[PDB]
C-alpha cells in the first residue's frame, strides 16, 4: 500500500543522514561502551587532562573560554551538516527560500540537542569525532556562566536516550523537527505541513516496524519534541547572555545569524 512509499522515504532519509552526518549514533555507542578494537578516547576530566589532550582537540584566553570556543567550532559544522540534510528532505528546497531559512533557524538547536544525545551518556560526551571524551563533572565544574551551559543538554539526553532510538529512527525524527509549520514568521505554512504529514507517518511506521517490542514509542517521542522547544529557549537566552557579559569572547557569525530575533 502507501506503506511502501513511506518505507522508501525512511530509507532515502536514512541514507542521506549517513552521508550528511560524520559520526552515527551506532559508532558513538560502540566507542562509548568500548565495543571496538580501536583505542578508547582521551578522557578530559580536569585542566591537566585538557592540557595533555589539547593536541587531540579538533579546534582550529582562559580554559572555560577555550572549551566553549571548541564547542562553538563544532556547533557551526553541525549547522552545515543539518543544512545539507534538510536540502535532501523531499520538497524542502522547493519551499520558499525565506522559509527554508526560518525552519533551519529555529530547527538546528533542537536537532543539535538530538545529535549531542547520540554522543552523551550520564557521565560525559564524545568529542573530536569520538577521539576525546569530556566529562560532565568537568564541564559542570567550569566557572559561570559556562558551567551550566552543557548540563541541560546532559539532562535531556539521559531522558532521550532511554528511548533507545537508532539512526534509522533518528533520521526521520530529525526531518520531522525541521519541517514544523508552527515556526514564527513562516510565509507559507501549507506545503511545509504537507511534507510533515508524510514524515510523521513515515516515522510512525518506522517505529512500529523497527521496534514492535515498544508501543507508544511514537507518542513518547512526540512528547520529547515539545519539551525540546522550551529547553532550546533556555539555551538561546543563556547564549545571548554570554554574548553580552563576556567581551573577550567572539561568537561565530553563522551562530549569530541564528540568535537574531529568536525569542
Amino acid at each position: 500500500p502507501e506503506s511502501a512509499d513511506l518505507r522508501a522515504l525512511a530509507k532515502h532519509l536514512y541514507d542521506s543522514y549517513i552521508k550528511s552526518f560524520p559520526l552515527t549514533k551506532a559508532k558513538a555507542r560502540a566507542i562509548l561502551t568500548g565495543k571496538t578494537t580501536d583505542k578508547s578516547p582521551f578522557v578530559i576530566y580536569d585542566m591537566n587532562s585538557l592540557m595533555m589532550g589539547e593536541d587531540k582537540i579538533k579546534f582550529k584566553k582562559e580554559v572555560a573560554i577555550r572549551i566553549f570556543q571548541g564547542c562553538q567550532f563544532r556547533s557551526v559544522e553541525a549547522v552545515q551538516e543539518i543544512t545539507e540534510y534538510a536540502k535532501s528532505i523531499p520538497g524542502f528546497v522547493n519551499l520558499d527560500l525565506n522559509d527554508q531559512v526560518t525552519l533551519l533557524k529555529y530547527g538546528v538547536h533542537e536537532i543539535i540537542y538530538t545529535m549531542l544525545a547520540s554522543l552523551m551518556n550520564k557521565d560525559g560526551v564524545l568529542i573530536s569525532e569520538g577521539q576525546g571524551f569530556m566529562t560532565r563533572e568537568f564541564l559542570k565544574s567550569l566557572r559561570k556562566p559556562f558551567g551550566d551551559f552543557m548540563e541541560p543538554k546532559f539532562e535531556f539526553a539521559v531522558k532521550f536516550n532511554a528511548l533507545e532510538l537508532d539512526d534509522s529512527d533518528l533520521a526521520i525524527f530529525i526531518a520531522v523537527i525541521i519541517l514544523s509549520g508552527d515556526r514564527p514568521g513562516l510565509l507559507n505554512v501549507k506545503p511545509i505541513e504537507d511534507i510533515q504529514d508524510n514524515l510523521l507517518q513515515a516515522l510512525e511506521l518506522q517505529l512500529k516496524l523497527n521496534h514492535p517490542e515498544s508501543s507508544q514509542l511514537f507518542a513518547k517521542l512526540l512528547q520529547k519534541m515539545t519539551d525540546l522547544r522550551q529547553i532550546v529557549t533556555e539555551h538561546v537566552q543563556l547564549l545571548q547572555v554570554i554574548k553580552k557579559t563576556e567581551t573577550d569572547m567572539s561568537l561565530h557569525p553563522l551562530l549569530q545569524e541564528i540568535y537574531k530575533d529568536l525569542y
Partner: peptide, 10 residues
C-alpha cells in the same frame, strides 16, 4: 542571513 542563504544555495 547571508551564510544561511549561501549554505542553502550551494
Amino acid at each position: 542571513h547571508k551564510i544561511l542563504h549561501r549554505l542553502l544555495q550551494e
